[PDB]
Symmetry: D2
Subunit: 132 residues, 4 copies
């Protein structure tokens, strides 16, 4: 497993529901953002523009342990491990300010697809970026 | 102006914020859905797949007059008028169940663009569908 | 496990991303809608308005097997099983038109919380509604 | 009119649609975030938690002049002017990197409501924060 990467996410009105906490599907959005920052979003845009390759989530196993509130700045904490040429495993967690446990945990499995939905190996330049 | 078209929208947890009403940007989503139903979404998909044409909102003038609540089934009420070969004007309103006034009003101006963001005339088959 | 319930979901511009398929976090929204229709959304609104009880997803294990496209009307197929007084297990699947396999699978575990985030038994009136 | 405030927004997969640009309703989300940063989101949370006051958009007049693309970091540029005790007028613009014109323009009118949807004057502490 890699080191832990950190990405802040602020909770705005778009993120909450009428129950007073973050609406749960939004956590996968925050996890997506955080993976982009590990990879480098400019490299993702170049890879898609120039080669029509992009990544897809194959599996996501989520645990929602605590409610996250409006105006919190949470830390998305991410690590990755390579699992062969095709798969990347991500551990991602949402931590509320000062918390002693993750509010949300995800174990995510990612693949790389072309525009025909065929699996492709993770490009070396992406892996380089991820490990830089 | 055309007749009024009706499209129901149910308000789920994804639609509300912690203030207890629908989060205002979502109303433009509902208006988008309702326009698709006037046009025929299958025709929109064929037009984009086969010709790379699609529509874009150029202007949206919104009035938010009342809060919409969880579990309401609202009526999106839409009419259109053609304004030359390029522009379509839409009047769209969200009506809460039993209400005597619209909760949300939009005056929307739509154009048709190719993939290079060039303005194109509204295709006759789209206009036919809209007026069918 | 209950019978399979069916809930249609149409894919609009709000649902897709620039890769040309549904953006994966949105599937959990569709699953949420479908659970509301099993439960009865009016009962959920009365339970929250009158008693300040509502449901929360504790776990969601997702498999994303195929990309879903613009203008498809998918079928969300849902079943539930009770697992004691506190937990409800849901199996939910997105089926593209005419498909021979689910595009998306979720195994969801749901709890019932009060406003203090304390676990509560599923109310009998909710269970009645679910089994009606 | 106040000075111009700046708030960056990065465009992720959640922001785009299959046409390859930002899905237009999302711009109002970015405008909402930017207003929170002018006001101070902690003050908004305290005002809602302690007094049950919050702000609402009454009017939004939007112009969408250019498409915004994946992985861009745009600048949301905001100014405000007070229009009596009840209303606040906001001018908000999305600027793509290096652009010579705004991609999106909004003229937004904001009010302050209690939980009964009654109009209230903008609290002095909010105005202080806004002008700090």
């Amino acid at each position: 497993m890699s080191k832990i990467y950190h990405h802040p996410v602020q909770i705005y009105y778009e993120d909450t529901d009428h129950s007073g906490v973050v609406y749960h599907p939004n956590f996968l959005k925050y996890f997506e953002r955080a993976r982009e920052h590990v990879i480098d979003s400019d490299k993702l845009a170049t890879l898609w523009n120039d080669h029509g390759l992009g990544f897809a989530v194959y599996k996501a196993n989520m645990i929602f342990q605590d409610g996250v509130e409006f105006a919190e700045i949470c830390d998305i904490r991410t690590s990755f491990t390579l699992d062969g040429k095709y798969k990347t495993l991500w551990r991602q967690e949402v931590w509320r300010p000062g918390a002693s446990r993750a509010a949300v945990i995800g174990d995510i499995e990612m693949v790389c697809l072309d525009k025909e939905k065929r699996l492709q190996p993770v490009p070396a330049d992406i892996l380089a970026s991820m490990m830089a």
